[PDB]
Amino acid sequence: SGAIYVGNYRVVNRHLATHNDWANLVWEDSSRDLLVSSTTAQGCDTIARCDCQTGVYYCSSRRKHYPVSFSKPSLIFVEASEYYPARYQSHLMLAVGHSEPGDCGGILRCQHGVVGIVSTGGNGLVGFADVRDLLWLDE
Numbered sequence: 839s840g841a842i843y844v845g846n847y848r849v850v851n852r853h854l855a856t857h858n859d860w861a862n863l864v865w866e867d868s869s870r871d872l873l874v875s876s877t878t879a880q881g882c883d884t885i886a887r888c889d890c891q892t893g894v895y896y897c898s899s900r901r902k903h904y905p906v907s908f909s910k911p912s913l914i915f916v917e918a919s920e921y922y923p924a925r926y927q928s929h930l931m932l933a934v935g936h937s938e939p940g941d942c943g944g945i946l947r948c949q950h951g952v953v954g955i956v957s958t959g960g961n962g963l964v965g966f967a968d969v970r971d972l973l974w975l976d977e
């Protein structure tokens with residue numbers, strides 16, 4: 839679990855969104871596994887606006903932060919689950935590292951701010967849904 843709170847927005851994994859998230863929906867994209875809902879309180883998370891390929895992510899399954907090199911956001915095949923059929927997930931970035939299903943929502947950050955959230959994993963690789971292109975999250 840985990841979310842990004844920026845201004846009057848809450849960013850979560852679309853497959854983990856609540857009834858409250860859907861009742862206050864702003865935007866969702868199943869191809870990216872993202873959902874953004876409105877909030878009443880302000881959020882102060884800084885979103886990174888960069889092309890960094892190194893950062894640190896939180897891994898709840900180890901209660902630890904790990905440093906990683908990660909690929910540029912791209913279309914990557916993701917196997918079926920109780921949430922989605924087999925498909926290509928866009929805006930996805932991979933890194934060599936540990937993750938487990940309950941690790942989704944863990945934040946990836948560089949020196950500039952929040953880069954994305956854990957969304958996929960398996961085979962010693964962790965996938966992060968990028969959020970750096972969502973310029974509207976600030977304005």
Ligand SMILES: NC(=O)[C@H]1CCCN(C(=O)Cc2cccc3ncsc23)C1
Nearest residue numbers: 871916919937938939942957958959960
């Ligand atoms: N975005 C999706 O389509 C995901 C929906 C939930 C299931 N997905 C996984 O990758 C499961 C998983 C297994 C093993 C490590 C792992 N680490 C994070 S999730 C994860 C795919």
Ligand SMILES: [Zn+2]
Nearest residue numbers: 888890948950
């Ligand atoms: Zn950066």
